[PDB]
Amino acid sequence: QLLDVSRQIKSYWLTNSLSTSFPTVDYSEPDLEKVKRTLTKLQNHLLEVSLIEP
């Protein structure tokens, strides 16, 4: 029974919320520009773009 209550108290110590979001994998930031090339060019595919013009 003491093992029971002990496990209980374990749960009570551990049922507390995590202080924040916690680290995992944020490694290697994605390219901003290959994304833009996919977006634009694959959407610009087969188009007669005249650059930007004034």
Binding site: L2, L3, V5, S6, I9, K10, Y12, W13, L14, T15, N16, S17, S21, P23, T24, V25, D26, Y27, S28, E29, P30, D31, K34, V35, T38
Partner: protein
Amino acid sequence: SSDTQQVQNILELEAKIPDILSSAGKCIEAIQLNNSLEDFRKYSKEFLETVEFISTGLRRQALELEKAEVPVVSLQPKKRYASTPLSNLIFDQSSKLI
């Protein structure tokens, strides 16, 4: 102790109890077998300590849990959507998805 450390204290406190039964079977052995008063004269000065000191350690783990004041109710989470590490890591995949 903090986080798991109280619980960890209980974890290594775990094996501290079963052998008290060895001390107690020997408490019986002191006169049942060994036939010497001196033995239980020592182990009554041991069994009660090995038990009760652990019990006090427990009751203080609980009362100081009651000082740490961890909430018992589980919050019902909102349907969570995206934590920041999840989001930017998904962006990393998006780079991999390029």
